[PDB]
Design a protein around this ligand. Structure first.
Ligand code: PAR
Ligand code: PAR
Ligand code: PAR
Ligand code: PAR
Ligand code: PAR
Ligand code: PAR
Ligand code: PAR
Ligand code: MG
Ligand code: MG
Ligand code: MG
Ligand code: MG
Ligand code: MG
Ligand code: MG
Ligand code: MG
Ligand code: MG
Ligand code: MG
Ligand code: MG
Ligand code: MG
Ligand code: MG
Ligand code: MG
Ligand code: MG
Ligand code: MG
Ligand code: MG
Ligand code: MG
Ligand code: MG
Ligand code: MG
Ligand code: MG
Ligand code: MG
Ligand code: MG
Ligand code: MG
Ligand code: MG
Ligand code: MG
Ligand code: MG
Ligand code: MG
Ligand code: MG
Ligand code: MG
Ligand code: MG
Ligand code: MG
Ligand code: MG
Ligand code: MG
Ligand code: MG
Ligand code: MG
Ligand code: MG
Ligand code: MG
Ligand code: MG
Ligand code: MG
Ligand code: MG
Ligand code: MG
Ligand code: MG
Ligand code: MG
Ligand code: MG
Ligand code: MG
Ligand code: MG
Ligand code: MG
Ligand code: MG
Ligand code: MG
Ligand code: MG
Ligand code: MG
Ligand code: MG
Ligand code: MG
Lengths: 219, 159, 169, 294, 34, 58
RNA sequence: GGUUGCGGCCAUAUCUACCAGAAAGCACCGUUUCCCGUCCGAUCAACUGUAGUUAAGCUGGUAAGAGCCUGACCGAGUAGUGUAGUGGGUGACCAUACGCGAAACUCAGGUGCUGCAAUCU
RNA sequence: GAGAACAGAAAUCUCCAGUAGAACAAAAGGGUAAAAGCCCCCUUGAUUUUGAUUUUCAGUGUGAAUACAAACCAUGAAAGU
RNA sequence: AAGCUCGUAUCAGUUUUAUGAGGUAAAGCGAAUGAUUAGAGGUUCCGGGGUCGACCUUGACCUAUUCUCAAACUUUAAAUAUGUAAGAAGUCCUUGUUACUUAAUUGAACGUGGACAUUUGAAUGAAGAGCUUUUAGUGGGCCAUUUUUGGUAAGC
């Protein structure tokens, strides 16, 4: 079936997530939110590009899926399989309902009907605020043209308006690149898995010493 | 079927506050209520006996009776167009001591003491309150503060 | 440095876990009175296990708690049985310790075949002075960091006196 | 312990009333004493507080106030030597003593001393102080056990039978005294009247004199060098009876030096708090030590 | 004299606690060969 | 057939024509629901303070 | 000022570690005839204050400590929201007008206050 | 979590941790930690009388409930309930 | 509709000030709960098998991080809406009654006699305030903006 995406496009209903009071709902056609090279070190991938919604609406998982697949297949096969880290920034937690009048042969019914209208779960979608990021990709600054088009190539699977935005920031973190590198000389950045931990001033002096040695090279 | 029983919809309402639970302290039991006292009504979930119906939560009335563990409070609720007279028998854990009138006494008492100042001097009284006023003319010094002039900021994306 | 904190034996509970009702349980209950002279206390079954043949609330085990003079010699009796050598386990990280031996004949206790044959569990808890700080009613406190019998501390107590041994590592 | 508590734990934990954490108060019971009738309005409720330290017996007449609790007048075991007992400070007969001290002490403060005499010569039999016909009514006080576990023949109920016997109205039943037999279910005033005047402690000295001298050497070592004998004990407390009722009035210690003078010394042994400039300087220094990746 | 010591447990279920099952077992142990 | 179920529409309007009144209070309110042995003893406290003015005036 | 009996508010009072504690008090502790309670004088009971002790309970301090309390044109006049137009936009949405206005964040500071009674270099 | 003959994943015993993460017939929600939970002891306030009050409401009935009065009882050292 | 008692007594689909109550919007998830993407660190020296006559995968737990959510989640928490007070029926002083109440001339009510008005104790308005009896029609409703449920939607 899959009645068209035009029926579910607008957020018409309070979020209806899969829950204890609502079970037996299908599975998101997108299970994979992180792909490309997801283990890459923070300093490896300075440049970041976003796919940002310009509209207040609902994105279906099946659409999210084909968008993800689309971006990747271009990005990899053009630049490289490991040349980027693509993250899907939205998770389809909203459960769509259908009534499903069609039952079994041989005839439809009269006149009831609308009676007992409440629907069974149909699909999933991710309700999206204006200016909410949909996709994020981090790569090396030399890959811009390839990354900027990768998301641009994926917008065509998305209902509504979305913009490709050049992120003034380092990688998938905060800290606009100078304010990042500023804390790189002070060695306040401890590489975690595919991310960093930052050195606070707020903690116990013992572990702060052990954790970030080169910050006090000294102070 | 619809469900209208006594405490329905009170879930969050009759909850005790985050990190306040268990036994109620002794200030509540150690308070004295005579007739005419104006009291605020707020139920307490820890005490099930003698607690207000959810309607009277937040309402304030004048106690008309004093019994062993409770005080009768007369309250005014509207039904149709009129106020009928409700009287509740409520325990002390559910009764506050209303600060609404308390200041009015501290107003009258200060009014009578400022009356003796027109008795011992003879100046004009100015007893009744007056609301906030248009303010007044003033002069703002440029000395050490010279107006710094701002423009509007352009548009730039922060993410 | 170490004036009041020396040591003692808080209590020793000899536990005999039967696993069945009736005679074997009721007889093993006489064994523990002939043991400490104290009359013991049986335990009900936690939950039914049809593999072990016991419904819940079935009287099964039995044990008794002894302190002071009567325990330390019955404890000393057992240390003769396992011959003053104990393993690196058998000592809890909370400082207490215990072992077990078969037959109970090995420490005193003549046969009396009109009783029958039983083994047992020797577990014994170590404490210090100021222990009722935690165990009292009024102003119940908690034993400080120092004090607070540790594993290596009650071992260096049990190796020194009794001249016993750690084992297995 | 490596049981170390998550910040989630210590953020959402609800700390009990302080006097629960330190375990000096059962508030469940305090509500059931302090709280008065609402048609009795502001006329306060009075509790008899009985507290046994190891070396002392505390007995206080107390009412309650939202600012904090009030004590009418208080006595002690450690006052009793002034009334003639150097030894046996915390024991049943000293509880009757302190209880009968505060009975005639507080009740004197009210001008109620003369009227409402007491039980006088003490048969140890069960009775309460009834009312004067056409006159005041006994000053009503209630027993506050504190945290104390109730048992039949417990050290606290001597102060009960002492204070009740001293004119105070402190209602009770006989059954938690010694002499209530849990089959007989009535009381024997002998076993009490014995205990009231010390008829246990003395009886032990006799029996102990026989069995062990070396045990009698220390345990009673205070009675030896003070020239005190076995059945002399009966008259130690029987005398203090007349002495209590004689001068119930409270004279305090004259407490050499003063208030201000104590404080000038009596804690110089507490540390001062730092300022932020102090703690911050240390931190910057504590870095220098621990620094260098060591 | 049968003196029983009572359980402080609030659990009135006859179900064995789910700390126990055919799983969590071990292919090891000193199975006697003699 | 099916029809309307409920509404509050227009009811605020109707209840404001003649409406909303007020508790219409007096001094010396009724004693309804006051402690009996107050209102019992209160009778004799007033029964007695009557004779006090059945004497004083003469 | 310490200390204790009863407290009010009930984390600025809780947790974790580590030190320091004179005086007095508190305890820890000795005792098992008597009332008394337990499988067990461990808890409860009673005797003694005598045989011993700050090791602990307890009270303080220390921690770029956890948590908690506090402040601010910190973020934010942001989110939201009351009123308004024949405002914009195909719509989804959005702007402006007259008002009300957060929580997260951040920087900063603080870590029980105190009643009645008694007592102590 | 760390510890004890058979005893194993699961028997019984111990210590430490444990803001409730358990239990309170049941639906769900609220409430409770020296308790409202577990356990033991004693009882029949699940009683008499007859009015008032809250919810629903027409301010009728009914169901349920709250605070009293007048008795007579239970319980506890008691205040109390 | 008929009036009746009175003549500014009392009010009020409004604000101001004082004082309550509420758990929606928003917000929060390196806070509880429930869900949810990704790596990194650390014990099992394994729950289980191998490589070897103890090293690597698999999982299970654990530690600090990371992406995204909730009508029937939540520490926090609006706007709008909402109970109360702003007096002569007031604030006090004294001391008569009672069978209630207290250790009690303690209280509790209710009185006796007495102190104080002039902004008499916020603004604004009042076409007058209160009261009673009787009786018609009606008891299919629909529409706009906004909040909102079911439904792909509807002039549903
Ligand atoms: N697009 C046409 C839509 O159908 C409407 O009318 C529908 C029906 O009312 C009308 O009658 C159809 C008939 O044509 C068709 N061949 C057989 C069908 N059973 C009939 O419909 C009938 O039966 C159905 C099902 O039981 C029920 O809706 C009802 O009893 C009745 N409408 O035909 C349409 C469907 O076939 C109107 N034509 C129109 O206003 C509306 O927009
Ligand atoms: N789905 C289509 C429509 O969506 C609308 O959605 C509106 C609401 O979700 C929300 O509107 C809020 C409103 O709820 C709230 N009660 C008042 C607030 N001023 C409005 O705000 C909104 O509208 C105003 C209009 O000038 C804009 O200025 C503002 O930027 C915008 N956020 O924002 C949307 C309009 O911007 C309405 N739900 C309704 O008309 C209809 O469902
Ligand atoms: N402006 C102050 C604020 O608004 C209010 O303060 C005052 C007024 O704004 C408020 O007026 C409200 C009105 O909003 C709404 N109509 C509800 C209520 N009926 C009115 O209040 C008044 O109503 C009538 C007189 O009109 C009186 O019978 C009633 O006693 C009185 N409270 O009455 C309040 C007291 O006179 C709120 N109390 C509070 O949010 C806050 O004080
Ligand atoms: N309460 C006073 C106010 O606190 C405010 O601060 C609020 C927040 O900044 C503070 O949040 C702290 C956070 O700073 C700190 N770095 C971590 C801590 N867990 C947070 O705590 C807070 O949030 C967590 C959930 O994240 C809750 O579990 C916790 O109960 C809450 N206090 O919680 C405070 C409220 O409790 C402001 N500093 C200021 O308006 C004022 O000081
Ligand atoms: N990813 C690791 C694995 O996944 C699960 O655990 C994951 C989470 O469930 C767990 O997250 C945190 C936890 O770190 C923390 N120390 C305690 C916290 N309550 C947990 O919370 C988790 O569950 C709660 C609901 O109970 C959610 O609200 C929350 O979003 C979720 N992170 O930590 C893990 C990583 O986030 C499995 N329980 C376990 O097998 C293992 O930890
Ligand atoms: N705002 C002040 C008011 O004063 C009022 O007081 C009024 C009345 O109580 C008082 O009336 C008294 C009356 O009490 C007493 N038993 C009889 C006496 N003749 C009346 O006197 C009054 O009425 C007569 C007759 O018309 C007039 O001649 C005389 O001027 C007038 N004082 O006269 C006052 C009017 O002048 C009320 N206490 C009350 O409404 C309010 O407090
Ligand atoms: N019960 C009989 C009644 O007792 C009344 O007296 C009792 C009380 O009403 C009277 O108290 C008076 C009170 O009447 C009057 N309206 C106010 C006055 N402040 C009170 O006085 C009270 O407080 C003061 C200290 O403030 C004490 O010194 C005094 O002893 C005390 N009674 O004191 C008595 C006990 O408290 C009157 N004598 C009378 O109405 C009648 O005889
Ligand atoms: Mg559609
Ligand atoms: Mg809908
Ligand atoms: Mg899903
Ligand atoms: Mg249906
Ligand atoms: Mg939003
Ligand atoms: Mg597009
Ligand atoms: Mg419903
Ligand atoms: Mg609340
Ligand atoms: Mg709140
Ligand atoms: Mg009930
Ligand atoms: Mg109690
Ligand atoms: Mg009299
Ligand atoms: Mg009785
Ligand atoms: Mg009796
Ligand atoms: Mg019909
Ligand atoms: Mg229709
Ligand atoms: Mg209809
Ligand atoms: Mg219907
Ligand atoms: Mg009309
Ligand atoms: Mg001992
Ligand atoms: Mg003792
Ligand atoms: Mg020390
Ligand atoms: Mg801190
Ligand atoms: Mg501060
Ligand atoms: Mg428009
Ligand atoms: Mg605006
Ligand atoms: Mg407003
Ligand atoms: Mg403000
Ligand atoms: Mg502290
Ligand atoms: Mg835990
Ligand atoms: Mg939990
Ligand atoms: Mg029950
Ligand atoms: Mg439930
Ligand atoms: Mg709950
Ligand atoms: Mg608690
Ligand atoms: Mg009674
Ligand atoms: Mg307000
Ligand atoms: Mg909510
Ligand atoms: Mg709600
Ligand atoms: Mg929300
Ligand atoms: Mg928040
Ligand atoms: Mg929860
Ligand atoms: Mg839960
Ligand atoms: Mg790993
Ligand atoms: Mg805040
Ligand atoms: Mg008089
Ligand atoms: Mg006018
Ligand atoms: Mg009509
Ligand atoms: Mg009709
Ligand atoms: Mg019709
Ligand atoms: Mg229509
Ligand atoms: Mg139409
Ligand atoms: Mg149209």
């Amino acid at each position: 079936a899959r009645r068209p995406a035009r029926c579910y496009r607008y957020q018409k209903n309070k979020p209806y997530p899969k829950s204890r009071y609502n079970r037996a709902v299908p599975d998101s056609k997108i299970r994979i939110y992180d792909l490309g090279k997801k283990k890459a070190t923070v300093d490896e991938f300075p440049l970041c590009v976003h796919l940002v919604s310009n509209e207040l609406e609902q994105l279906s998982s099946e659409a999210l899926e084909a968008a993800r697949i689309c971006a990747n297949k271009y990005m990899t096969t053009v630049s490289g399989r490991d040349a980027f880290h693509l993250r899907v920034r939205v998770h389809p937690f909203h459960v769509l309902r259908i009534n499903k009048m069609l039952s079994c042969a041989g005839a439809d019914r009269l006149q009831q009907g609308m009676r007992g209208a409440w629907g069974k779960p149909h699909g999933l979608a991710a309700r999206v605020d204006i200016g909410q990021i949909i996709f994020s990709v981090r790569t090396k600054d030399s890959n811009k043209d390839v990354v900027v088009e990768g998301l641009r190539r994926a917008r065509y699977k998305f209902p509504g308006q979305q913009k490709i935005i050049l992120s003034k920031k380092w990688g998938f973190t905060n800290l606009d690149r100078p304010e990042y590198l500023k804390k790189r000389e002070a060695g306040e950045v401890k590489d975690d898995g595919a991310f960093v931990k930052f050195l606070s001033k707020k903690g116990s002096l013992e572990n702060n010493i052990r954790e970030f040695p080169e910050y006090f090279a000294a102070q | 079927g619809k469900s209208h029983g006594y405490r329905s919809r009170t879930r969050y309402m009759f909850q005790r506050d985050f990190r306040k639970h268990g036994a109620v302290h002794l200030s509540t039991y150690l308070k004295v209520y005579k007739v005419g006292d104006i009291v605020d009504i707020k139920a307490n979930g820890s005490i099930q006996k003698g607690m207000p119906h959810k309607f009277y939560q937040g309402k304030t009335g004048v106690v008309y009776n004093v019994t062993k563990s409770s005080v009768g409070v007369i309250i005014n609720k509207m039904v149709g167009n009129r106020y009928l007279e409700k009287r509740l028998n409520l325990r002390v854990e559910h009764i506050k001591h209303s600060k609404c009138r308390q200041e009015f006494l501290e107003r009258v008492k200060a009014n009578a003491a400022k009356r003796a100042e027109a008795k011992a001097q003879g100046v004009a009284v100015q007893l009744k309150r007056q609301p906030a006023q248009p303010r007044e003319s003033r002069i703002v010094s440029t000395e050490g503060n010279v107006p710094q002039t701002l423009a509007p900021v352009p548009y730039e994306t922060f993410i | 440095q170490n004036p009041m904190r020396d040591l003692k034996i808080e209590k020793l509970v000899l536990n005999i876990s039967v696993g069945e009702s009736g005679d074997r349980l009721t007889r093993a209950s006489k064994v523990l009175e002939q043991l400490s002279g104290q009359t013991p206390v049986q335990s009900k079954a936690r939950y039914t296990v049809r593999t072990f043949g016991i419904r819940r609330n079935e009287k099964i085990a039995v044990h008794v708690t002894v302190r002071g003079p009567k325990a330390e010699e019955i404890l000393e009796r057992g240390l003769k049985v396992k011959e003053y050598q104990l393993r690196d386990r058998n000592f809890s990280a909370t400082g207490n310790f215990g072992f077990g031996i078969d037959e109970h004949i090995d420490l005193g206790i003549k046969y009396d075949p009109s009783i029958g044959i039983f083994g047992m569990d020797f577990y014994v808890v170590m404490n210090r002075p100021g222990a009722r700080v935690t165990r009292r009613k009024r102003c119940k406190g908690t034993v400080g960091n120092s004090h607070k019998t540790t594993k290596e501390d009650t071992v260096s107590w049990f190796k020194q006196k009794y001249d016993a041994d750690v084992l297995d590592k | 312990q490596k049981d170390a508590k998550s910040s989630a734990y210590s953020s959402r934990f609800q700390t009990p009333f302080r006097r629960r954490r330190e375990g000096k108060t059962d508030y469940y019971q305090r509500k059931r004493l302090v709280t008065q009738h609402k048609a009795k309005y502001n006329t306060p409720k009075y509790r008899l507080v009985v507290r046994f330290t190891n070396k002392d017996i505390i007995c206080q007449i107390i009412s309650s106030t939202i600012t904090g609790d009030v004590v009418l007048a208080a006595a002690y075991s450690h006052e009793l030597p002034r009334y003639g007992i150097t030894h046996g400070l915390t024991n049943w007969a000293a509880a009757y003593a302190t209880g009968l001290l505060i009975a005639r002490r507080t009740l004197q403060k009210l001008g109620l001393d003369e009227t409402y005499k007491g039980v006088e010569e003490v048969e140890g039999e069960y009775e309460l102080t009834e009312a004067v016909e056409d006159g005041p009514r006994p000053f009503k006080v209630f027993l506050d056990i504190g945290l104390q576990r109730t048992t039949t023949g417990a050290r606290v109920f001597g102060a009960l039978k002492g204070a009740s016997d001293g004119g105070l109205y402190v209602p009770h039943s006989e059954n938690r005294f010694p002499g209530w037999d849990f089959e007989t279910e009535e009381i024997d005033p002998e076993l009490l009247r014995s205990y009231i005047f010390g008829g246990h402690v003395s009886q032990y000295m006799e029996e102990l004199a026989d069995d062990d001298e070396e045990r009698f050497s220390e345990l009673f070592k205070g009675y030896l060098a003070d020239d005190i004998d076995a059945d002399s004990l009966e008259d130690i407390y029987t005398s203090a009876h007349e002495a209590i009722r004689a001068d119930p009035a409270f004279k305090p210690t004259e407490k050499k030096f003063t208030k201000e003078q104590y404080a000038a010394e009596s804690k110089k042994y507490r540390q001062t708090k730092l300022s932020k400039e102090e703690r911050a300087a240390r931190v910057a220094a504590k870095i220098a030590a621990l620094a260098g990746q060591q | 004299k049968e003196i029983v010591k009572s359980n402080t447990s609030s659990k009135k279920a006859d179900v064995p606690p789910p700390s126990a099952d055919p799983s969590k077992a071990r292919k090891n142990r000193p199975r006697p060969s003699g | 057939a099916k029809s309307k179920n409920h509404t509050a529409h227009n009811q605020t309007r109707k209840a404001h024509r003649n409406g909303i009144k007020k508790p219409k209070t007096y001094k010396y309110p009724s004693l309804k629901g006051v402690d009996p042995k107050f209102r019992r003893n209160h009778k004799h406290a007033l029964h007695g303070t009557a004779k006090a003015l059945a004497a004083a005036k003469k």
